[model samples]
Structures are given as C-alpha cells and as structure tokens.
Target chain A: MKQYLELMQKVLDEGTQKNDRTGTGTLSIFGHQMRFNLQDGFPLVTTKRCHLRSIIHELLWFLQGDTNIAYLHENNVTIWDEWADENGDLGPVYGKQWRAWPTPDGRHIDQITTVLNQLKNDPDSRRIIVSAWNVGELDKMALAPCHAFFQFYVADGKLSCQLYQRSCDVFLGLPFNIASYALLVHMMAQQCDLEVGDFVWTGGDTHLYSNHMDQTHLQLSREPRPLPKLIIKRKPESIFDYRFEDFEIEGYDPHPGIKAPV
Target chain B: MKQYLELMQKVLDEGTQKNDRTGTGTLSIFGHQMRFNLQDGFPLVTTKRCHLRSIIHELLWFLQGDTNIAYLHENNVTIWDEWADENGDLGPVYGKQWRAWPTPDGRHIDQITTVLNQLKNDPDSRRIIVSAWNVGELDKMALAPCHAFFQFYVADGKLSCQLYQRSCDVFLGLPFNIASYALLVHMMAQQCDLEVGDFVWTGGDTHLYSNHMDQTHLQLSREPRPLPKLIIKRKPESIFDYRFEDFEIEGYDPHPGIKAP
Candidate 1:
C-alpha cells in the first residue's frame, strides 16, 4: 500500500508534537519499524476503505477473549464503541490479555496457548512471546494497550510476527493495525503448520493527529485498490479453532470508508 | 547527533535483505525506535571515539550480574572479547540472565532485583521488565542478545528507559548503543530518586554493515564532540551499588576511535 501511503505522508510531513493522555494531541515520531510481506499482497489499505467486517469480527473478538461490547455490539462493530464498559466490558482487553491472562493465585495465562506450545516445541524459540501489557489490568483497560506486545519467529518453515505497538493511531489505527496483525499472521500460520512470514510492526507513539489534517489529505488522494485475499473457510485444527463462517474476503475494492472519531 | 545521522541515512537508504545467524549478514530492518534526551547530552559517539572506559566497565559488568569475562578481562575490557568462552564463560548471559534467572523450578529469577522492586513499587508498572533473552541459553552464547530486552519508566519524576534492541551494529554498534543505555538511564536515575528520562532506543536488526559502507561515509565526515558528561560517582545508593572507581567520563573529546574489523 505504498508503504501505507508513505506512512501517511511521513506523519503529516515530519511529525513532532505530542501532548496525549488520550486528549489526543500527537504528531509524534518515536522509534518506528514496519514490515509486511504476507506474501507481499493482502496488506489491505487500498488507500482508505478497510472494513473486512470490522477486520473479521475484531479478530474473532480477540480470539474470544471477549472483553464484552456484546460481541462488538453483535457484529455491527462500532469500532469498539468508545471503549465499552457498562457490562460491555473491555477490562481484560486484547482477547482477555491474549486468551485469558489473569494469574495471581488462580492461574490463567494463555498467551495464545503459550504461542502454540512454543511453536510446537521450540522452533528455535526466542521465547516466542505473546504479551498484552496486562499489568494487572492496566486500569481495567478501556484503552491503554495500543497493540501492547507480540513476538514470534521461526526460520525456514516460516512464521514471523512482531507487533509491539505501544501506541499508534496512525490514520485511525494503522490500517486496522495492518489487517489485524496480518490476520494474526494468517491465523498463526494455519495453526502452526507454518508458511506465512513477517508482520513486524513496532511503534511506541507513531502519530498523526493535527485534527486528521483533512483526513490526512483525503487519504493521499486515493489510489491503491488491489490487495485483498484472505479466505479462511475452516482448516481449524486449532489456533483456537476459529469459526465465524470460517472466514473469507475474496477481492475487495476501495476508496470509501473513513470515519475516525474514536 | 542529527538523529544519529538521520538513522544512518535511513538505514543505508531503505534497509532490508537479511541472512544472519551471526555469520553477520543483515541489511535488515524490522522495527526501529530511537530517542535520547537525557536532557540532551552524554549520548556519546559524536561520530566515533567512544571508549568511556569500555562503556563504564560494561555497565559495571551488567550490574555485576557478570557471566564471566572475568571482570571483563580483569578490566582490559575487550568489548566482550568476541564472546568469551575458553572458560571465560558467557552463558546465562547478561549477568546470568540478569541476576539468576533459571526458572521452571531450579529457582533463581532475580530479574534485576525484580526489576528494582518493580520500579520501586509500580511507577506505572507495565511489568517494569528487564529480560536478557535467555531462551534456554542461545547455544551457550558468545553473542546472542544485542541488548535483548529492557524497560523501566517512571514518568513525572523522570527516570525513563526503554531499550528493546534486538540487534544493531550501526557503525560498529550505535554509538556504544547510545552510551550503554544512556548510562543505564543515569544509573537508574541515580538509584530511583529520579530525573534522567528518555533513552528509548528500540531496534530489531537496525543495519549498517555492507562492509560498513565506507565506514559509514567516513564517520559522517567528522565534526561532533560537545556532549559527553557521564560522571556517576556520588556514592551510588544501590542499583548494585557502583564501584569501578565509581565511574566517570567528564566532557569527552572523541572523534578518533574507529577501527572495527
């Protein structure tokens, strides 16, 4: 996607402001890192118009770690409607801290099933991490984790994924955080059979908010419509056995959606 | 340093190639991040000449977590002499995995005194973190972790520090990895009283080794040496109570220490 439109015109031409605490005042330029490779295609940003059904039911409501929002308001997905919390909890955020992270005395640390059993028994394990930044529920998180943390790597058999987004709202959340972590690295490389590599996106405060600068120059005058090819219809041997009509996307065209108010 | 020479001329103009297992091949670039501002000074390596007594005795042998380089070759500091091993050991690296990490049940997970008592009792604790990346000891190291993991933030009172360096060799190691984590965030903001903020340098294979690209264009045509003040001798109240002559470096002169090979 033209490197996501040259990172939105280099954070609106050389970003550098900063005020945030959610009062939203960024322009930032902290350490940046980006990589996509999902076989070089489906990065899905065709110049502003992304809604693979709210990025596949918000990654199946973060792999069913369901912090409420009543299944993202029963699918209409109001982009997490202003951080739900009225029984529509968002407390144990990020798929309940990546699967159910509660551990204190009564354990529950499923970091994605401990990264698929450490990639089916240490595939050159660099501790194949998977964190959610759940410092004992960061103030019952409505919002504190901007993709908090993620790490996974395996060599030739292939299965890369990095993601450490401390915070990034780059044009209404980095193209659905790069198509929801490249569809969670293509559903954890089809339940660890391994063959999809590279996702990598790291950031700490990768910004761009001067009141969106006219929707970031009207999404850099639109023009990127090809990339669109995810078709998950169920080969679920377990990456938590995903469902939702298994999944599919077909071909997607763009240049329409852009409503950032979150 | 002009944003470290504009991130080494944008990672040698765009970065990406890869092939490493420390056979040392990498034009790589995965995720990068940088920020100095220890009130804007002492980030050493104004384009070269950086010794600071071997980065203050290798950060006091990693807060004395030391995994044998025998007190860094009894202080001659061979910059970890090509990953010590002839019994000079190195495993459980970064000071035996930051002070005794050997879990599962052998018991010994200090993790830098539990990340300094979790930044002295949760100063916005995001798991204060201090991992040295053991992964069951990467083949008993000689060189595995390029500053693997680091985190500690205090906010308002200052004390900041963020290092997540997966790898970097920018001109023979990013200005001594930015003066060894800005002198470990000025020695953990002088043992946590606080005030030294920001060292945020994150990288995961930040490149610069196409045969050092003309030694990074001859050390970016020299000219940069007015910022080097890492003293640190005020009695050091813990953070592994300082020693090595309580460390010092007062206004360095730099721009003459390049000879990597």
Candidate 2:
C-alpha cells in the first residue's frame, strides 16, 4: 500500500496540470507501473476501511460482461449509479467489451473467454489480452471507459496481469482500480488452476484531480494497515460465474472509512 | 542504451527456449517501459551502427494501411519478408487494423483517420487511439503482431505517443522500433498540426532471442557515432501521402552494420 501512497504523493507533488474531457483538471503523469504479488496477500488498501463488497460485486459484474447495472444495483453497489443510463445500461462498457465485444460480422467475440483459451492452449501467447475500449461502441456508452485496456502474462506457472487504465482519479478511483484488477488476477488464477501471480497497474492520465487535493493530502497522512486478504468463497468455473458473496475478505483492521470526494 | 544491452545479454547468457507457436525460442522479461522526448532529436541508437531507411519506408506503408508487402519488398526492406506469404499478402495486419478494422456490421472503421479527426475535433477525447491488434483477424495474420498497439496523447499543443509492443527482439529490432515510432510521431504531428512530443515505449514481453548474444556484446563494445538527423522533405498534408523520397537523414556515422547473430 505504500507503493500506492507513493504514487499518489508523487503525482501531487510533481505531476503537470492537464485538462480532460471529464471537465476536471488533472495533475497528470503517464507510463507508471506498479506490481502487486498476490503470493503475499490480497492488495486491498487497509489504511482506510474500504468496503470489499462493492469491489467484489463490480468485478463480478465485469466478468458477467453485463453492460446493464441491474445486477450491481441489486447487490446495493452504487459506485456506477451516477453514470448509468435510463435502462441502467452502460452500453459496451467494460463488461460488454471484456466478455462479448461485437465484431463486424453478426457474431460477438468473447475476449475474456478467448484469453482463457489462450492461456490453456498457448500459455506463451503474447496476444492474451482484453481491452475495455470498444471504438465502435463508445457512442452507446453512458460514460467512456476510464480503464481502457489490460493484458495477462503467464510465466513460470504464475499469471501476471497488467491493466492500462487510460485515466484515473487518484484519490477516489485508483485504490478501487488497483483492488479490482488484483482481484481479477486472483479469480483468473483460481480458474486456470495456476498459482496466483502479480498485478501490474499502468495508467495514462493518472492524476489527482484539482478538486480533490484536500482528500488526497488527507489520505497520504494516514498509515497503511496490514493488507487484508480476500477469500473468494467459490471458485468460479468460468469467468462469468462470479457472484457478490462468493468473495470474502479476512484479516482487515482499519480506521473509519473516509468519504472520497469525486 | 545499457537497458537494451542488458536485455540482449540476458537472453544470450541464459540461452534460448521455445515459445509460442512461432517456434522462435525467446528469453523475455515482463513489463518494461522507456521514455524518449522528441525534443532530443530522433532516438535512433547511436550506440550501434543503425540504418534508418527501412524504418521510414515501413512507417509510410503502415500509414497507407496496406497489408501487402510488395512496396516494402520492392525497396529491399526484409524486416517483414520472413512472415509474408508467396503473394506478399500478410493479411489484415497493422494497416488494416489501423485504418479499417472490421466491426459487427460489414462496414470498416478507419482508426487512423478517426484518430486524426479526434485530435482536431476533440483533443481531450480519452478514446483517441489507434490499435493494430484485430482479434477477429488474428488467425489470418502471417505472424502475430510484435508491435501490437499504440496510443496518442496531446498536451500543450504537442502530441505524444506511447507504443505497446507485446514482444521485441532487443538486439535486432529495438533500434529500428525506436526510430520508426519517433518518425511516426514526427509525421503524425506534421499532419495533425502539432509539435512532436514524447515517445513512450511500453512492452509486455520485451525480450531478446537466444541467438543474439555475441552481437549484443559486440554492439556494447563499439563506440557510438553521432545520431543521424532524420528530415522529412515535405510536410505532407495527409498522414498517408508521404513517400520515401520525401525523407532524408544526416549526421549518421557508424561502423558498418554488424551482422545480427
């Protein structure tokens, strides 16, 4: 978690100011990578009491590849509430792109399933990747993707995942982004029957948005607790079979959760 | 480029191991990134005697979004020769994936044109990108793409580019890769009406093949020459309209090109 903190502090202290379409000015930096080895423990930032429920449910929703927020709302996760459309649809978002990206033909290509098959059939395949940014479908999405793309690496019988998030709100969104992908690695490893590996996070406009400086500094002041370990209650047989309660977190000890200003 | 040398040394020192379906045994490291600012001139490795002609031509071919290798082969550029089929067709690789990616409909999506438009129309669009990895067309490729994807960024009226290469043969290919993309940034900036910005090279499996060790050491021992200045003859209005004669290089003084072991 110190690594996460250092990233934030570094961005705030030295990053250059850049304006984004989100209408938030960002003190942004590009091409930074951080690795979290799951062999140690799950990388849930324990300094503040972050809820595991929303994170788990969100990842499950992504695996299900559902663009509709009905499943998330049913599980009481409101993180995506602000951006969903009238049908609770976030068209061709992460879930849609990951699981069933539409192709030029009448068929849809399941990138996630293909990635799993690649891992099984050709572990050395460098093309084992899943991208959430669907160019043809962005007009349909309620909000454009922030975490644009990610790829998986398999070596020495361990699976390492790297996420290329095009933009991240340092205080409000980065921690969750880190946890979500790390958890994705854990879930994928469990399904692949390989030892859990590392999660490498890379970002484009990784920043502390101007409005959240106070929150950013406040978070930096806190000390990180022992990283909590996540216990996924069930080993999902496929990428799409995950449910909210199927993930459980143990060994969490932290101060009261702080409200992150978005 | 100590980093480049170290990568080559690692592969040769440890020897080769078979990888992927290519039967091209590889020694790789995961997750590496190196940044070069365009203000420093072209990043062609002065550390090794390098050629820039093929790199420029290949970039022009990619911008044209052509999958056939006739134009490249005609110019004696063999970088892509090993992978091409008898007809010089390499499938819908970089060019097709860049300019005309297939969609669920029968229509085509021109990613390069779209990106250029996006850069002009909506500079802040996070989705302003051009990807060459076409999943739907992967099976048709002669060789799986090594330089898989790249994205563009603009800030302070200058455009920057970041390339993600899934695999790289450091000794044989990296210098060319750098020169090619830096040229890309320059050409892209000329058409987009922006100054050249940073070129960030990111990799997934940046590695050296097992066979290139001695060459790597020899390169390290060689004294670096002054880097050549790459000059595009004319500012082409379109990203794809430029030709080989429209470019020139100066200041390159290297030992004769070493044989890639």
Candidate 3:
C-alpha cells in the first residue's frame, strides 16, 4: 500500500505530460520500481476498494490458456469483452503465449508450466522466467502486453517474483496488476510448498492518466488501511485447478471505490 | 563507478551462497538497479582499467548482425573466443536477435532500424522497445542472453535507455554491460540529435562469483576516479557506419588497472 501511494505521489510531482496513442494525455515517468513484501499481508490497496473478484477470474483464465472471453464471461468478468473481436477472441494474447508459444519448428513452449516445474525442482534457478511479449504474435493480439515479463526468485525457502511492465496506467490499471501478480505469487508459492517472500513491480513507462487526476488525488488523500489477509480455502490439485470461491479476503476495510473513465 | 563499487560491497555484505551451472558458486542477490547519467561522463569503471576496445568492436559487430567471432578476430578482440564453436559461431546470439528477429510469417524485423525510425518519427510512442529474449529461440543460442531486453525513452528532447539483465556477474561482467549500454545511449543520442539522459540498469539475479572474491575485494579497496569523457570523431550517415577509430576517450586519469584471479 505504501509503495502504490509513493508511486502516485512521485508521478504527480515529477512526471512529464505526454500524449499517448489513447489520445488522452498522461503525466508519465520512466524506469521506476516498487517492492511488496508478501509477508506484509495481501497488497490490495486500502485507499480504495479494488475488484479482487475480477482479478481472480482473469488470472485463472490466463492460466487456462483460453484466448476467448467465454470463460471470463462465465465467471461474470467482462474486462476482456471490449477487447474481443466478433468471435469473442482476443487472438494469441497472454493466455496463448503463456501456455503455448509457437516456435518456427512447430512446437509450443508452455512457459508457465516450465516456470512452475523449475520453481519446484530448481528453486535457485535465475532462468525461472515467464514472458508474454511474443513479438511474432504482436500483430495478431488485440493489444500488446503491458505487464509483459516476469521472473521468479527463491531464497531461504521463500519465493519472490518481479514483473517488468512496459507501460502502466497508475491510476486505473496498476492497482489491478499489482494485486493480480501478488495473488499469482501466493498461488505459485502454495503449489510449490514454499512461503511467500516479496513481489517486485518494475515499470518502463509508468503514467497517471490526465482524466483520472481527481480520483488519483482523492485516493491519495485517504489514509492507507492495514492490509487485508488472504485465505486460500483449499490447495487445488494443481495451479490450474483454482476456483473463484476458494479465495477469501478478511478485514479489507477501505474508502469507497473511485470510478473513472477507461 | 560509485554505483558499481556499492553493488560489490552490498553483494559481499549481504549475499547468499548458491551453486551455478558453471560449477563456480556465487554469492548472489536478486533484484538490483543502477543509474548512470551520460552527462556525468563515460561510466567506464575507474577502479580497474577496462577494455573499451573489445566493447566497441562487440557493439559494432552486434549492430552489423554478425554472430561469428571472425569479425572480432579481425578487430583483434577475442573476448567472445571461448564461447565460439570450431566454426567460430555463437548461434542466434545478440547480434542476430537485435538486428533481425525472425517472425512466424517469414519476415525479419530489423529492431535496430525500427528503433531508430521511432526515435525520429514517433518519439512519443510508448512501444519503443527492443527485446532479445525470443522465447522460441533460447535453445538455439550458444548461451542464453543475460543482458536480454532493453527499452529506449525520450523526454524533453533527451534520450534515456533502461536495460533488464536477467543475470549479472557483478565483478567481472557488470562493469562491461554498464559501459556497453551507456556507450549505446551515447551513440543513439548522437544519431537522434538529442542530448543524453540517464542509462538505467535493472537486474534479476545479480551475483559475485566465489572465485572472484580476491579480485573483488582488491578492486573494492581502490578509490574510484572521475569518469572519462567520450569523444566521437565523426557523425556517420547511419547508426551502423561508425568504426572503432572514430571514437576517442579524453581525461581518463586513473589508478593503474588491477589484476587478480
């Protein structure tokens, strides 16, 4: 929570006003990093209530390797609906790349499964990486990956992860991404029989949208509440077996949600 | 230079002993970052004399899309000699990947030219990125890329670059990488007609090898001198047309180069 708050404050103070492809302007900065100690509790922002509901289904959907919005729709998640084509397909996005990156020789490398295997077998491996920035497939995807690359690190039997996001919408999207990856770390650690360590969020083009300035200011004014606790009801047989109902967040007392334009 | 010295001290003070693939164990830490503003000076480490000769040729060769050690041999720089095969080839390494990344649809994306064009045409676009971490091609390489991905940023008519290194040999290799990217920033800024900005280095698994402890401490005990000024003799028509002789370093006063194992 402190990390998120500090980033917002820095962007407001030191960011440059830049026009983006969205046509809406942003106060942006480059090359910033924040660390979240998972031991500090679930890193859901206490400033404003967030939609962990949508985050859970979205992450689970990415793991299932489904590029279609059908699975998300089944779980009452509509985030991907707008991005989908007439066939409800967002072609070869994170799901396809994570589970199946097509090689020139006609083989698909399942990077997620590879990372999970490496975590369980070789915890000290520096090469435990998962990347969604499939350059070859960039033309096919509805949009390029913002939270593109991530690496897993293990020390003293605790699992840590770092994400390299090329671009971030600090006001609207970053909070979702932070909680989303933190949740993934929780799941990955549980599956690997390891304790949680830290989640490092690194950014390339970190920005706050000009339109969300009011919400950003209001959110910043609120005091950071104590982080809520995470409870996973059951150990799924595998990482892929997680369900939305299995997750519970206790004591997430926070200010009311701030609604802003997309 | 202070940034590098600080990293070595931190690695020595707070690091974990871990076995590596090369059977040389390392005192390693994960997630570290450093920044170098080109305006300060060329960030070649002054604690120990470095071979800018090798670095320049290596970079020039990478820009040329040449993966063979023959070009390095021609320049009398054999830094990549050990990694080369009998044919003197390191397959699909940085050079091949940076200059021409193959697509599934039988197209080669010249990422360097693409980046240069973006720097000139669409400076405001956030997609100005050059990545060498092709997931499909890792196994084909002689060695996986350590300085794998990097991005170029433009702000206020200045060029800044950030590199994401997957692993770093803090003692032996990191100084080289820091200078390599810094040199790249200098060249890119010169070509783009923009002033230089910060060159940011971020790492995943940063380490000091156990074998390099004697060398590390010896280098750490020495004081860092002022950074050297870089002078590019001529502005080539393109980013690729510059030769090693076209560059010069001025005011590189330093302690003698340290040698240790």
List-wise, what DockQ does each model earn? 0.03, 0.53, 0.70
**Residue pairs whose backbone atoms clash in candidate 2:** A103-B103, A103-B104, A104-B103, A104-B104, A233-A246
TM-score of candidate 3 versus the correct structure, residues matched by position = 0.98
CA RMSD of all predictions: 21.8, 2.3, 1.3
Top candidate, metric lDDT: 3
DockQ of 2: 0.53
Considering DockQ, where higher is better, how would the candidates rank from best to worst?
Answer: 3, 2, 1
> Candidate 1, TM-score vs. the true structure?
0.33
How well is each residue in B93-176 modelled by candidate 1, as lDDT tens digits?
777777875543355666777777766776554346666654444456676677776767565677766777766778787788
Instruction: Kindly report which residue stretches of model 2 are placed more than 4 angstroms away from their true locations once superposed.
Output: B6-18, B223-226
How does each model score on TM-score?
0.33, 0.93, 0.98
Tens digit per residue, CA lDDT, model 2, B132-162: 7666667788876778777788878888888
TM-score of each candidate's B chain against the true B chain? 0.33, 0.90, 0.98
Q: Would candidate 1 be rated incorrect, acceptable, medium or high by CAPRI criteria?
A: incorrect
Name the best candidate (by DockQ): 3
> Compared with the true structure, what per-residue lDDT tens digits does model 1 show for residues A45-112?
87777777788788877887777887778778887877786677777678887876654334566778
